[PDB]
Amino acid sequence: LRVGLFPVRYLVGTGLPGAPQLVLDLMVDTVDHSVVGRAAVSQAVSPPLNFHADVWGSYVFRLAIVQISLQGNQGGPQSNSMITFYGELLLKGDGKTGVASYRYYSNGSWHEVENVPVKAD
């Protein structure tokens, strides 16, 4: 409801057959430097991976990287559900490309995807 917000969609992954794919639909508040949105992790493997989380975090600019830290769960930050997602995006300063790592919880275990490409749109 305040002026300072914009959306952005990031596709995180190598894009290789059978590789994990993370889609982040993010809201960015350029005043408080805060971020909120959704994470979806899928993989065209057998069985199908359909992981989802409400995510939140913040961004920081260092001179040129824009670093976005995210964590997530079922419901968001006011929910007391366990954190099931952590992500760190190291985007180039234009906010359109970069590298990312993340960890997600599924089937009683953590799964980590490290240093994969990031693109917007």
Numbering used by the authors: 5 to 67, 78 to 135
Can I see the authors' text?
It contains two predicted domains: an N-terminal domain of unknown function (14.5 kDa; DUF1842) and the C-terminal domain (DUF1843; 5.4 kDa), which tends to appear in multiple paralogous copies within individual bacterial operons. The N-terminal domain was predicted to fold into a β-barrel composed of eight antiparallel strands. Polar residues are found covering the exterior surface of the β-barrel, while the interior of the β-barrel is lined with mostly hydrophobic residues, without space for a channel through the barrel.
Q63NT7 presented a challenge for obtaining large, well ordered crystals. The highest resolution resulted from data collected from a single crystal specimen. Efforts to phase the highest quality data set (form 1) using experimental techniques did not lead to immediate success; selenomethionine-labeled protein crystals did not diffract, and we observed no heavy-atom signal in the diffraction patterns of crystals soaked in caesium chloride or potassium iodide. Form 1 crystals gave a combined LLG value of 719, form 2 crystals gave an LLG value of 394 and form 3 crystals gave an LLG value of 305. Because the form 1 crystals gave the highest resolution diffraction data (from X-rays), a model for the β-sheet-rich domain was refined against these data and then subsequently used as the starting point for model refinements of the other crystal forms (X-ray and electron). Final refinement for the form 1 model gave an R factor of 25.1% and an R free of 28.7%.
